Amino acid sequence: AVSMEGFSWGNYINSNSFIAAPVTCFKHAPMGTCWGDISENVRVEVPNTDCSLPTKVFWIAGIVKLAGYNALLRYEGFENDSGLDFWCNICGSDIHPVGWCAASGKPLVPPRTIQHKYTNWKAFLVKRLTGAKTLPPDFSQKVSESMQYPFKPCMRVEVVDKRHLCRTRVAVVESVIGGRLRLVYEESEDRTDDFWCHMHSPLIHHIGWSRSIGHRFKRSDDGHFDTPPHLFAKVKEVDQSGEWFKEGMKLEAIDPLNLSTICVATIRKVLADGFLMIGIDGSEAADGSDWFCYHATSPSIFPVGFCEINMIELTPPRGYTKLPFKWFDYLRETGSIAAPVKLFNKDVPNHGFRVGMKLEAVDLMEPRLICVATVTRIIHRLLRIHFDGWEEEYDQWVDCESPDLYPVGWCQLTGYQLQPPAS
């Protein structure tokens, strides 16, 4: 019970017998779609650290345990001996397929521990490796390509105004890490004023999107060029020609200023291409500057009664005193209707998340931070994300297809800083 080392996913998982969400659960993540072959008992070639030699050589290792990008390896020949089991990023540079060492002409050197556990190594490896699963062809090329992102620095995009949700303003991509963009407002009012978001964030749009859709924008008064519109994530097309959302319709929505809560909300504006301006009752400026933009297909908006039927705490209007809050009484007092349930119809993906699974999650209240996290609840496609060590008051509601969730090891793979559990 005396831990005298820093944080590592490996020891964290082994010690408490944790389970990590596989890379498969993250479509946006690198190798998220080319991961079907990676599994336990898959053999690879990795450097042999069990060598007194001053140089470096390789050996065969099998995957004992797979946690996100991180794989627990055991050198071939140890069998059940876990004495030299070591963790690694399976997408790491030193991990190769099995043909790679000899077809390139380097000798496989057995670990010093089992050098005399078997006499004939040619016969040994032939019996062990014949018909064994390994890494897919051009796998290292796959990994390399996954680390190459179409969003380049100096690209201009439109993004929501952090301090004025109702309008967008032009930001510039200054740096890209693991598909995550550090955006800087073109007309900053703060020295390090940034906007961390993913490439395929629904919050960023091409130049001219605000004007085209009817969304408010900040009018402005260096090598920067406009992002090719074909790079942005595609929005699901809808048919708003018939029955559709109307101004005044009541609903439930995740507060963009507090992603820990789902709030009583109202449709304030119906825009083009499916987009809607939504306000939270009790927290609306008279000029409508607090109106946020959710698409009609957004997983962050819910029909009236969603929270109650699924046993989720609903945040009543600020200042509202008739507790506990009842939608029926509120619809009478405010003389309004609920947005029809049929408008919220959406597919519920087989995401593969399970309660208790570990992952790397963006702090949505501070997008700079990416922290060790856990899935504590699952409401169809709605996930309750908990940050290990911290108070559950700050658990955030996150969609299962969110690009702000990442597999275990994503930080190490992409070179992004990972926050460890609170002390």
């Binding site: 060492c101 002409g105 050197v109 490896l125 014949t130």
Partner: peptide, 16 residues
């Protein structure tokens, strides 16, 4: 897919 994987320490045949 299966291929003939090279081993130096001859060849072995494995699935990728």
């Amino acid at each position: 897919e299966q291929k003939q994987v090279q081993i130096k320490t001859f060849s072995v045949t494995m699935w990728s």
